[PDB]
Every structure is written in structure tokens, then in C-alpha cells.
Amino acid sequence: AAVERAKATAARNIPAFDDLPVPADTANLREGADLNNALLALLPLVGVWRGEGEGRGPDGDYRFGQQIVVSHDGGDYLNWESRSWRLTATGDYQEPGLREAGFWRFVAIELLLAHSAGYVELFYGRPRTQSSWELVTDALARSRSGVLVGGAKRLYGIVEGGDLAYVEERVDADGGLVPHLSARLSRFVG
Amino acid sequence: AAVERAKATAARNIPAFDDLPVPADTANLREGADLNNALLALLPLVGVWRGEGEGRGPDGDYRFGQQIVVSHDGGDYLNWESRSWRLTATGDYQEPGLREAGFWRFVAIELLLAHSAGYVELFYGRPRTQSSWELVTDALARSRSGVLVGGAKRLYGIVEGGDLAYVEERVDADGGLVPHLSARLSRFVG
Numbered sequence: 280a281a282v283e284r285a286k287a288t289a290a291r292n293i294p295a296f297d298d299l300p301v302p303a304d305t306a307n308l309r310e311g312a313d314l315n316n317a318l319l320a321l322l323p324l325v326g327v328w329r330g331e332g333e334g335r336g337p338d339g340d341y342r343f344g345q346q347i348v349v350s351h352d353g354g355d356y357l358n359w360e361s362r363s364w365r366l367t368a369t370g371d372y373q374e375p376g377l378r379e380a381g382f383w384r385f386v387a388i389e390l391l392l393a394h395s396a397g398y399v400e401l402f403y404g405r406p407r408t409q410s411s412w413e414l415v416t417d418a419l420a421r422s423r424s425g426v427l428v429g430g431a432k433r434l435y436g437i438v439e440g441g442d443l444a445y446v447e448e449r450v451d452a453d454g455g456l457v458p459h460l461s462a463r464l465s466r467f468v469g
Numbered sequence: 470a471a472v473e474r475a476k477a478t479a480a481r482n483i484p485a486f487d488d489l490p491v492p493a494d495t496a497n498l499r500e501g502a503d504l505n506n507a508l509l510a511l512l513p514l515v516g517v518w519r520g521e522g523e524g525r526g527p528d529g530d531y532r533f534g535q536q537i538v539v540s541h542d543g544g545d546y547l548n549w550e551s552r553s554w555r556l557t558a559t560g561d562y563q564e565p566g567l568r569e570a571g572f573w574r575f576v577a578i579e580l581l582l583a584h585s586a587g588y589v590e591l592f593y594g595r596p597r598t599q600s601s602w603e604l605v606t607d608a609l610a611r612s613r614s615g616v617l618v619g620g621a622k623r624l625y626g627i628v629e630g631g632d633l634a635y636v637e638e639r640v641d642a643d644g645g646l647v648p649h650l651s652a653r654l655s656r657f658v659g
Binding site: 352 | 485491550565581583589591593608615
């Protein structure tokens with residue numbers, strides 16, 4: 280079953296224009312531009328990931344679904360996009376959730392993000408193993424209508440079976456990092 | 470000829486996954502989720518734009534090609550991606566150029582960006598007409614390996630024939646805004 284799943288995802292790639300003079304974005308390291316040497320520590324992230332997660336809100340815990348797309352065009356960065364959506368307690372689609380887009384660079388890890396909710400964020404961090412990474416917020420800036428937020432720590436890692444798991448903690452008013460989000464996503468592409 | 474071009478681009482949309490519970494990203498206001506009412510001032514931007522531009526560098530002026538993708542998923546923001554590439558003086562593909570990704574919001578205009586070169590940027594501004602917009606940098610933050618840059622002013626507008634044109638100025642050391650980039654892009658989608 281595990282060998283077949285890998286075969287299925289290895290045959291896929293993201294939808295992309297094939298008609299530009301620059302390389303098409305690829306989320307499958309079997310296709311497209313060579314991965315830049317700077318990025319080898321991040322190699323397991325490349326792909327499309329889909330699954331569900333759990334968050335801690337004002338009204339208790341809640342469920343969400345999510346897709347993360349991690350691609351590259353042969354440059355010294357990874358393209359990153361995450362889209363989430365709220366699920367009811369019973370697992371039904373409720374409404375759209377948060378979206379973010381940006382880039383990973385490795386040169387120490389940097390994650391540069393814009394958020395649809397109306398702020399930008401810079402994360403800095405380090406690999407913990409060949410397939411796990413830790414990042415912490417170093418800068419935040421919002422637009423006038425943007426949400427008010429605090430710094431975070433994100434821990435990402437490939438877990439047994441190949442899924443991408445993560446935990447995001449946020450700083451509380453009292454300065455302590457507390458649980459905020461967690462998710463485990465199955466590979467869909469790559 | 471102009472009616473036929475509009476017909477050609479109106480029949481197209483961006484490559485996108487069609488299998489998620491959230492709406493597929495659309496760069497064609499004839500297809501997909503309703504455009505959020507907050508975004509009507511920005512409506513002419515939605516689409517895929519392709520063309521060439523000119524920049525001012527250390528060694529004189531240079532040419533580049535560019536694609537900008539402006540889409541939405543029914544939320545109160547536009548998705549934005551720009552990819553550029555250097556051209557030789559004679560118009561030949563030279564090497565990849567800069568990439569940025571983020572979101573426009575309208576609620577005053579906000580443009581929130583991550584840049585592949587290693588920084589995040591917040592722009593704030595205002596519509597000048599139904600089809601032109603002005604934005605100025607309010608925040609910049611870089612990663613350790615990121616490029617050193619200064620604030621900019623961007624002016625975007627739809628010009629006669631329907632092309633998207635823009636000018637980007639940067640602040641010089643002496644505090645003056647000077648020409649930096651300009652481009653005129655034809656609609657490819659929408």
C-alpha cells in the first residue's frame with residue numbers, strides 16, 4: 280500500500296503554465312529544473328500536501344482542512360503557498376480560512392510570508408534533522424485593516440509514513456509560548 | 470483585431486486544482502467564485518499579464534520579461550504573483566530575475582509581498598482612477614542573506630488598448646525618488 284501511494288504521487292505535478300522562457304514551477308523533484316544545491320536540507324518539503332489540522336480558538340478547539348504547495352523553479356528558494364479552510368466540529372466544510380504565500384531560503388533557514396489576513400512576517404530558524412525544521416518569527420507588519428497578531432514558533436517535520444506534520448505555537452500576553460495549531464498532511468504530489 | 474484579442478483571453482483561465490472544497494483560484498471574472506464586493510476598485514487587475522519592461526541598473530538600462538498573475542478565490546483579497554527574467558540587450562532570454570508573491574486588499578489599498586530575493590514588504594496607497602493605483606512602501610524586513618533595498622513607489626494602470634502598465638521608482642540615498650523599473654504588459658488571461 281505504501282509503495283503504491285508513493286507511485287501515485289510520484290506520477291503527479293502541480294498545474295502550471297508550460298509556455299514561459301523560465302522553468303515551470305515543479306512540486307515533483309523527478310520533473311523540471313534541477314533543485315538548487317542550496318536547498319538540499321529542505322528537499323523533503325517539495326510537493327503538495329493535503330490534510331486536516333486542529334486549532335485552539337476563543338471558543339475551544341476547532342478543525343480545519345489545508346493544502347500546502349511547495350514548489351521551485353530552479354532558483355535558490357522554494358515557493359510556498361498554504362490555503363486552509365474551517366471545518367465544522369463534525370468534519371463538514373464550513374468556510375474559507377487563512378492563506379499565506381512566500382518563499383523558503385537556506386543560507387540557517389528563512390521563511391518570508393505575506394498573509395491574506397493583512398500582514399507580512401519574517402521567520403528565521405534552523406534544521407533539526409534531515410527532515411525536520413524549526414522557525415521563529417523575527418518581524419511582523421500589518422496593513423491598517425490587517426489582523427493583530429503575535430510572534431510564533433513553527434516546527435515542521437516528515438513523520439513515519441512520509442506525512443508532513445507541524446505544530447505552530449504563539450506567544451501569549453504573559454510571554455509564554457502556547458499551542459495554537461497542529462496538523463498532519465498526506466503527500467498528494469511528488 | 471481588438472475584439473478578437475479580448476475573445477481569446479476571455480476563453481482562458483490559469484491552471485488550477487479543481488478538487489478542493491474551497492473555490493479554485495480564478496484569473497477570469499467570467500468563471501469561479503463571485504468577486505468580493507470589497508475588491509471592485511481593483512477589478513481590472515484580475516488576469517494574467519505578460520510582456521517586457523526596462524530597468525535602470527549600475528551598468529545602464531536593461532531589458533526584462535515578466536508575467537504577473539492576479540487571481541482570487543472569493544475572499545476579500547487578490548492573489549498576486551510576479552515572475553521576471555533578464556533579457557540581453559538584444560531581447561534574448563538571459564537568466565531568471567526576481568519573483569514576488571502576496572496579496573492586494575482594499576479596505577485605501579494594501580499590497581503585502583514576500584520577495585524571493587529575501588525580504589518582505591508592505592505597500593499602502595490609493596486608487597487614482599477606476600483603472601489606476603498608486604502604492605508606496607511602509608515597511609521592509611530582510612532575512613540575513615536577503616538583498617539590501619530602499620522604499621519604492623509603484624504606479625499601476627490600464628492603458629489605451631487594455632494593457633497593464635506600471636512604473637516603479639525607488640528612493641535614492643539623497644532622499645529623491647528616481648526611476649527604477651517600468652513595463653507594459655499585454656493581457657493573456659481574463
